[PDB]
């Protein structure tokens, strides 16, 4: 997971939103030791979400847990803290994480 290559390089997510996608992936996996500044733990979390080592029954990967996230509150907090309009970007990240480079 710490390697030179990146999971999100095979998706439509821009590199400026890679930490946003990794924070979504880490918060979706119910991790609590995670800190925003720790990029390594973010990469481990997104790697275990997209390529789990022990997937559950009839599930290829843990991407289905993203549907429990409340993206609206996350977009509201992003707009409050950083003055970024990213409401559609969270949806695009979610769709790309669930299926990397669909046929549109």
């Amino acid at each position: 997971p710490q390697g030179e290559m990146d999971l999100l390089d095979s998706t439509r997510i821009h590199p400026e939103d890679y930490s946003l996608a990794r924070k979504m992936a880490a918060d979706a996996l119910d991790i609590e030791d995670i800190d925003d500044d720790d990029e390594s733990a973010m990469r481990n979390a997104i790697y275990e979400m997209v390529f789990p080592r022990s997937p559950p029954k009839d599930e290829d990967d843990l991407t289905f847990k993203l549907d429990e996230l409340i993206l609206d509150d996350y977009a509201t907090e992003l707009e409050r803290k950083h003055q970024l309009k990213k409401r559609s970007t969270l949806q695009i990240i979610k769709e790309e994480l669930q299926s990397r480079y669909r046929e549109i």
Partner: peptide, 11 residues
């Protein structure tokens, strides 16, 4: 110190 934001999950 503040508290790190944790994304709420559907219930």
């Amino acid at each position: 110190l503040e508290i790190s934001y944790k994304i709420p999950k559907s219930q």
